[PDB]
Design a protein around this ligand. Structure first.
Ligand SMILES: CCCCCCCCCCCCCCCCCC(=O)OC[C@H](COP(=O)([O-])OCC(O)COP(=O)([O-])OC[C@@H](COC(=O)CCCCCCCCCCCCCCCCC)OC(=O)CCCCCCCCCCCCCCCCC)OC(=O)CCCCCCCCCCCCCCCCC
Ligand code: SF4
Lengths: 56, 216
Protein backbone atom coordinates (compact mmCIF):
# COMPACT_ATOMS: atom_id res chain seq x y z
CA UNK A 1 0.00 0.00 0.00
CA UNK A 2 1.11 3.56 0.80
CA UNK A 3 1.16 3.52 4.61
CA UNK A 4 3.97 5.15 6.57
CA UNK A 5 6.75 2.77 7.59
CA UNK A 6 6.18 3.42 11.30
CA UNK A 7 2.48 2.62 10.85
CA UNK A 8 3.56 -0.51 8.95
CA UNK A 9 5.73 -1.57 11.89
CA UNK A 10 2.86 -0.87 14.29
CA UNK A 11 0.50 -3.02 12.21
CA UNK A 12 3.02 -5.86 11.97
CA UNK A 13 3.62 -5.85 15.73
CA UNK A 14 -0.09 -5.57 16.59
CA UNK A 15 -1.22 -8.37 14.27
CA UNK A 16 1.93 -10.44 14.86
CA UNK A 17 2.45 -11.16 11.14
CA UNK A 18 3.85 -9.36 8.09
CA UNK A 19 0.81 -7.74 6.50
CA UNK A 20 2.89 -6.28 3.66
CA UNK A 21 3.37 -9.76 2.20
CA UNK A 22 -0.36 -10.50 1.87
CA UNK A 23 -2.76 -7.57 1.43
CA UNK A 24 -6.51 -7.98 1.08
CA UNK A 25 -6.66 -5.03 -1.33
CA UNK A 26 -5.75 -5.70 -4.97
CA UNK A 27 -3.51 -3.13 -6.64
CA UNK A 28 -1.84 -4.24 -9.88
CA UNK A 29 -1.52 -8.06 -9.89
CA UNK A 30 -5.03 -8.67 -11.28
CA UNK A 31 -5.71 -9.37 -14.95
CA UNK A 32 -6.29 -6.56 -17.43
CA UNK A 33 -9.89 -5.55 -18.04
CA UNK A 34 -9.30 -6.01 -21.79
CA UNK A 35 -8.14 -9.41 -23.06
CA UNK A 36 -7.20 -10.87 -26.45
CA UNK A 37 -9.92 -12.82 -28.26
CA UNK A 38 -10.12 -16.58 -27.58
CA UNK A 39 -10.45 -19.51 -29.99
CA UNK A 40 -12.52 -22.06 -28.01
CA UNK A 41 -11.96 -25.58 -29.44
CA UNK A 42 -14.93 -27.52 -30.80
CA UNK A 43 -15.30 -30.97 -29.27
CA UNK A 44 -15.11 -34.72 -29.86
CA UNK A 45 -18.03 -35.19 -32.27
CA UNK A 46 -17.07 -32.49 -34.79
CA UNK A 47 -15.80 -35.13 -37.22
CA UNK A 48 -17.07 -35.29 -40.80
CA UNK A 49 -16.82 -39.04 -41.47
CA UNK A 50 -17.22 -41.50 -38.58
CA UNK A 51 -19.94 -39.50 -36.85
CA UNK A 52 -23.31 -41.18 -37.30
CA UNK A 53 -25.57 -39.95 -34.51
CA UNK A 54 -27.07 -43.36 -33.72
CA UNK A 55 -23.66 -44.47 -32.41
CA UNK A 56 -23.46 -41.60 -29.88
CA UNK B 1 -35.75 -55.45 -73.55
CA UNK B 2 -32.63 -53.92 -75.05
CA UNK B 3 -32.32 -53.72 -78.83
CA UNK B 4 -29.32 -56.08 -78.80
CA UNK B 5 -31.12 -58.67 -76.67
CA UNK B 6 -34.11 -58.84 -79.01
CA UNK B 7 -31.91 -58.56 -82.11
CA UNK B 8 -29.80 -61.61 -81.23
CA UNK B 9 -32.94 -63.65 -80.46
CA UNK B 10 -33.89 -64.86 -83.98
CA UNK B 11 -30.31 -66.00 -84.62
CA UNK B 12 -30.36 -67.80 -81.26
CA UNK B 13 -33.60 -69.56 -82.21
CA UNK B 14 -32.35 -70.55 -85.66
CA UNK B 15 -28.87 -71.77 -84.66
CA UNK B 16 -29.96 -73.09 -81.26
CA UNK B 17 -29.17 -72.14 -77.69
CA UNK B 18 -26.25 -74.56 -77.45
CA UNK B 19 -24.35 -72.79 -80.23
CA UNK B 20 -24.74 -69.45 -78.43
CA UNK B 21 -23.75 -71.04 -75.11
CA UNK B 22 -20.62 -72.41 -76.79
CA UNK B 23 -19.03 -68.95 -76.61
CA UNK B 24 -17.87 -67.29 -73.41
CA UNK B 25 -17.44 -68.59 -69.90
CA UNK B 26 -20.14 -70.42 -67.97
CA UNK B 27 -23.13 -68.17 -67.17
CA UNK B 28 -21.51 -65.54 -69.47
CA UNK B 29 -22.41 -67.09 -72.80
CA UNK B 30 -22.36 -65.71 -76.32
CA UNK B 31 -20.94 -62.77 -78.22
CA UNK B 32 -21.07 -59.09 -77.32
CA UNK B 33 -20.69 -55.70 -78.98
CA UNK B 34 -17.85 -53.62 -77.52
CA UNK B 35 -17.54 -49.86 -78.05
CA UNK B 36 -13.89 -48.94 -77.51
CA UNK B 37 -13.45 -45.17 -77.18
CA UNK B 38 -11.15 -42.72 -75.44
CA UNK B 39 -7.36 -42.66 -75.75
CA UNK B 40 -6.91 -45.49 -78.23
CA UNK B 41 -5.45 -45.32 -81.72
CA UNK B 42 -8.57 -46.66 -83.49
CA UNK B 43 -11.76 -46.21 -81.43
CA UNK B 44 -14.41 -48.47 -82.92
CA UNK B 45 -17.39 -50.76 -82.44
CA UNK B 46 -16.55 -54.46 -82.73
CA UNK B 47 -18.15 -57.84 -82.03
CA UNK B 48 -16.22 -60.28 -79.87
CA UNK B 49 -16.61 -63.28 -77.60
CA UNK B 50 -17.81 -62.58 -74.07
CA UNK B 51 -14.75 -63.49 -71.99
CA UNK B 52 -12.08 -61.89 -74.20
CA UNK B 53 -9.34 -60.31 -72.05
CA UNK B 54 -9.41 -56.52 -72.00
CA UNK B 55 -5.78 -56.09 -73.03
CA UNK B 56 -6.08 -58.42 -76.01
CA UNK B 57 -9.26 -56.69 -77.20
CA UNK B 58 -7.70 -53.22 -76.91
CA UNK B 59 -4.48 -54.19 -78.69
CA UNK B 60 -6.28 -56.20 -81.39
CA UNK B 61 -9.27 -54.10 -82.46
CA UNK B 62 -8.67 -50.60 -81.05
CA UNK B 63 -5.04 -50.42 -82.17
CA UNK B 64 -3.74 -50.10 -78.61
CA UNK B 65 -3.51 -47.24 -76.16
CA UNK B 66 -2.14 -43.93 -77.46
CA UNK B 67 1.58 -44.10 -76.73
CA UNK B 68 1.78 -47.84 -76.07
CA UNK B 69 0.28 -50.07 -73.42
CA UNK B 70 2.64 -48.61 -70.80
CA UNK B 71 0.86 -45.25 -71.22
CA UNK B 72 -2.47 -46.63 -69.97
CA UNK B 73 -3.76 -45.08 -66.74
CA UNK B 74 -7.38 -46.17 -66.29
CA UNK B 75 -10.26 -47.94 -68.01
CA UNK B 76 -14.01 -47.60 -67.50
CA UNK B 77 -15.21 -50.90 -69.00
CA UNK B 78 -18.99 -50.58 -68.82
CA UNK B 79 -19.90 -46.99 -69.54
CA UNK B 80 -20.08 -44.10 -67.12
CA UNK B 81 -21.97 -46.10 -64.47
CA UNK B 82 -19.18 -48.60 -63.83
CA UNK B 83 -16.25 -47.84 -61.50
CA UNK B 84 -12.88 -47.37 -63.15
CA UNK B 85 -10.00 -49.81 -62.75
CA UNK B 86 -6.27 -48.95 -62.87
CA UNK B 87 -3.64 -50.49 -65.13
CA UNK B 88 -2.64 -53.20 -62.64
CA UNK B 89 -6.17 -54.63 -62.88
CA UNK B 90 -6.57 -54.22 -66.67
CA UNK B 91 -3.69 -56.68 -67.20
CA UNK B 92 -5.47 -60.00 -66.55
CA UNK B 93 -9.16 -59.09 -66.41
CA UNK B 94 -11.74 -60.86 -68.58
CA UNK B 95 -14.65 -58.97 -70.12
CA UNK B 96 -17.58 -60.95 -68.68
CA UNK B 97 -20.07 -60.10 -65.95
CA UNK B 98 -18.53 -62.20 -63.17
CA UNK B 99 -14.88 -61.37 -63.85
CA UNK B 100 -15.57 -57.63 -63.81
CA UNK B 101 -17.78 -57.95 -60.73
CA UNK B 102 -14.82 -59.63 -59.03
CA UNK B 103 -12.72 -56.57 -59.89
CA UNK B 104 -15.46 -54.50 -58.18
CA UNK B 105 -16.67 -52.92 -61.43
CA UNK B 106 -19.27 -54.90 -63.38
CA UNK B 107 -19.51 -55.26 -67.16
CA UNK B 108 -22.66 -53.17 -67.55
CA UNK B 109 -23.03 -52.21 -71.22
CA UNK B 110 -19.50 -53.09 -72.46
CA UNK B 111 -18.39 -49.54 -73.29
CA UNK B 112 -14.62 -49.29 -72.83
CA UNK B 113 -13.47 -45.72 -72.14
CA UNK B 114 -9.65 -45.68 -72.14
CA UNK B 115 -7.59 -42.98 -70.41
CA UNK B 116 -3.80 -42.77 -70.62
CA UNK B 117 -1.43 -40.87 -68.33
CA UNK B 118 -1.98 -37.60 -70.22
CA UNK B 119 -5.40 -37.15 -68.57
CA UNK B 120 -6.70 -35.41 -65.47
CA UNK B 121 -8.58 -38.37 -64.01
CA UNK B 122 -10.35 -36.28 -61.36
CA UNK B 123 -11.59 -33.91 -64.07
CA UNK B 124 -13.00 -36.82 -66.10
CA UNK B 125 -14.82 -38.28 -63.11
CA UNK B 126 -16.13 -34.81 -62.23
CA UNK B 127 -17.46 -34.43 -65.78
CA UNK B 128 -19.23 -37.78 -65.42
CA UNK B 129 -20.76 -36.67 -62.11
CA UNK B 130 -21.89 -33.44 -63.77
CA UNK B 131 -23.53 -35.52 -66.50
CA UNK B 132 -25.39 -37.45 -63.80
CA UNK B 133 -26.37 -34.14 -62.21
CA UNK B 134 -27.86 -32.92 -65.49
CA UNK B 135 -29.77 -36.18 -66.12
CA UNK B 136 -31.45 -36.63 -62.73
CA UNK B 137 -35.24 -36.72 -62.95
CA UNK B 138 -35.45 -35.18 -59.48
CA UNK B 139 -38.19 -37.43 -58.12
CA UNK B 140 -36.62 -38.97 -55.01
CA UNK B 141 -34.65 -37.05 -52.40
CA UNK B 142 -31.38 -39.09 -52.36
CA UNK B 143 -30.57 -38.71 -56.06
CA UNK B 144 -32.08 -35.23 -56.44
CA UNK B 145 -30.03 -33.69 -53.64
CA UNK B 146 -26.98 -35.92 -53.22
CA UNK B 147 -26.00 -35.99 -56.89
CA UNK B 148 -25.86 -32.19 -56.94
CA UNK B 149 -23.97 -32.29 -53.64
CA UNK B 150 -21.43 -34.72 -55.11
CA UNK B 151 -21.15 -32.59 -58.25
CA UNK B 152 -20.28 -29.54 -56.15
CA UNK B 153 -17.80 -31.51 -54.03
CA UNK B 154 -16.10 -33.01 -57.10
CA UNK B 155 -15.91 -29.63 -58.83
CA UNK B 156 -14.17 -28.32 -55.72
CA UNK B 157 -11.93 -31.41 -55.68
CA UNK B 158 -10.72 -30.69 -59.22
CA UNK B 159 -9.15 -27.44 -58.03
CA UNK B 160 -7.94 -29.03 -54.80
CA UNK B 161 -10.04 -26.56 -52.79
CA UNK B 162 -10.88 -28.98 -49.96
CA UNK B 163 -9.16 -30.88 -47.14
CA UNK B 164 -8.40 -34.62 -47.03
CA UNK B 165 -11.10 -35.32 -44.43
CA UNK B 166 -13.77 -34.37 -46.98
CA UNK B 167 -12.70 -37.39 -49.04
CA UNK B 168 -14.07 -39.77 -46.43
CA UNK B 169 -17.23 -37.69 -46.05
CA UNK B 170 -17.70 -37.80 -49.82
CA UNK B 171 -17.41 -41.59 -49.66
CA UNK B 172 -20.13 -41.73 -47.02
CA UNK B 173 -22.31 -39.39 -49.07
CA UNK B 174 -22.10 -41.93 -51.89
CA UNK B 175 -23.17 -44.68 -49.50
CA UNK B 176 -26.21 -42.60 -48.57
CA UNK B 177 -27.24 -42.44 -52.23
CA UNK B 178 -26.53 -46.01 -53.35
CA UNK B 179 -29.25 -48.47 -52.36
CA UNK B 180 -31.68 -45.75 -51.22
CA UNK B 181 -33.05 -44.48 -54.54
CA UNK B 182 -36.04 -45.39 -56.71
CA UNK B 183 -34.07 -46.36 -59.82
CA UNK B 184 -30.42 -47.23 -60.46
CA UNK B 185 -29.33 -43.74 -61.56
CA UNK B 186 -28.35 -43.05 -57.95
CA UNK B 187 -26.22 -46.20 -57.88
CA UNK B 188 -24.72 -45.26 -61.24
CA UNK B 189 -23.83 -41.82 -59.91
CA UNK B 190 -22.36 -43.13 -56.65
CA UNK B 191 -20.24 -45.91 -58.17
CA UNK B 192 -17.70 -43.84 -60.20
CA UNK B 193 -17.04 -41.63 -57.17
CA UNK B 194 -16.37 -44.75 -55.09
CA UNK B 195 -14.04 -46.15 -57.74
CA UNK B 196 -12.09 -42.90 -57.93
CA UNK B 197 -11.77 -42.66 -54.15
CA UNK B 198 -10.76 -46.33 -54.01
CA UNK B 199 -8.04 -46.20 -56.65
CA UNK B 200 -6.73 -42.61 -56.87
CA UNK B 201 -6.89 -41.19 -53.35
CA UNK B 202 -3.17 -40.22 -53.40
CA UNK B 203 -3.87 -38.02 -56.43
CA UNK B 204 -6.68 -36.19 -54.60
CA UNK B 205 -4.56 -35.74 -51.48
CA UNK B 206 -1.58 -34.47 -53.48
CA UNK B 207 -3.79 -31.99 -55.34
CA UNK B 208 -5.18 -30.71 -52.04
CA UNK B 209 -1.64 -30.37 -50.66
CA UNK B 210 -0.53 -28.42 -53.74
CA UNK B 211 -3.51 -26.06 -53.51
CA UNK B 212 -2.97 -25.58 -49.77
CA UNK B 213 0.72 -24.71 -50.13
CA UNK B 214 0.16 -22.50 -53.19
CA UNK B 215 -2.66 -20.49 -51.56
CA UNK B 216 -1.04 -20.60 -48.09
C1 LIG C 1 -0.98 11.65 15.27
C2 LIG C 1 -0.34 13.02 14.94
C3 LIG C 1 -1.02 13.70 13.74
C4 LIG C 1 -0.27 13.45 12.44
C5 LIG C 1 -0.74 12.18 11.71
O1 LIG C 1 -1.82 11.74 11.92
O2 LIG C 1 0.12 11.52 10.78
C6 LIG C 1 -0.27 10.19 10.49
C7 LIG C 1 0.77 9.58 9.54
C8 LIG C 1 0.07 9.04 8.30
O3 LIG C 1 0.46 7.69 8.11
P1 LIG C 1 -0.45 6.73 7.10
O4 LIG C 1 -1.89 7.16 7.18
O5 LIG C 1 -0.33 5.30 7.52
O6 LIG C 1 0.09 6.92 5.55
C9 LIG C 1 -0.88 7.01 4.51
C10 LIG C 1 -0.43 8.14 3.54
O7 LIG C 1 0.36 9.03 4.27
C11 LIG C 1 -1.65 8.95 2.97
O8 LIG C 1 -1.17 10.22 2.55
P2 LIG C 1 -2.14 11.15 1.55
O9 LIG C 1 -1.49 11.27 0.19
O10 LIG C 1 -3.50 10.48 1.39
O11 LIG C 1 -2.34 12.67 2.22
C12 LIG C 1 -3.58 12.97 2.86
C13 LIG C 1 -3.38 14.23 3.71
C14 LIG C 1 -4.50 15.23 3.42
O12 LIG C 1 -5.73 14.74 3.95
C15 LIG C 1 -6.44 15.71 4.70
O13 LIG C 1 -6.18 16.86 4.58
C16 LIG C 1 -7.56 15.28 5.67
C17 LIG C 1 -7.00 14.72 6.99
C18 LIG C 1 -7.09 15.74 8.13
C19 LIG C 1 -7.65 15.11 9.42
C20 LIG C 1 -7.76 16.15 10.57
O14 LIG C 1 -3.39 13.89 5.08
C21 LIG C 1 -2.74 14.85 5.91
O15 LIG C 1 -1.93 15.58 5.46
C22 LIG C 1 -3.10 14.93 7.41
C23 LIG C 1 -2.65 13.67 8.18
C24 LIG C 1 -3.12 13.69 9.64
C25 LIG C 1 -2.85 15.05 10.33
C26 LIG C 1 -4.12 15.64 10.96
O16 LIG C 1 1.43 8.52 10.18
C27 LIG C 1 2.32 8.94 11.22
O17 LIG C 1 2.95 9.94 11.09
C28 LIG C 1 2.45 8.10 12.52
C29 LIG C 1 2.80 8.96 13.74
C30 LIG C 1 2.62 8.23 15.06
C31 LIG C 1 1.34 7.38 15.10
C32 LIG C 1 1.47 6.14 16.04
S1 SF4 D 1 -32.51 -42.00 -58.52
FE1 SF4 D 1 -33.85 -42.23 -60.34
S2 SF4 D 1 -35.94 -41.79 -59.55
FE2 SF4 D 1 -34.49 -41.01 -57.97
S3 SF4 D 1 -34.19 -38.82 -58.52
FE3 SF4 D 1 -32.52 -39.97 -59.55
S4 SF4 D 1 -33.35 -40.42 -61.63
FE4 SF4 D 1 -35.13 -39.82 -60.35
Amino acid sequence: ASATRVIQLLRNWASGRDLQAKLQLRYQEISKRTQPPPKLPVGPSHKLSNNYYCTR
Amino acid sequence: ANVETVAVSPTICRRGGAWFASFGRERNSGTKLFNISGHVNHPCTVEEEMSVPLKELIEKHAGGVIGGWDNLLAVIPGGSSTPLIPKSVCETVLMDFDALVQAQTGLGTAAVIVMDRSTDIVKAIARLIEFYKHESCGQCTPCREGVDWMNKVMARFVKGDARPAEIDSLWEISKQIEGHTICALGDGAAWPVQGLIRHFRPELEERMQQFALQHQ
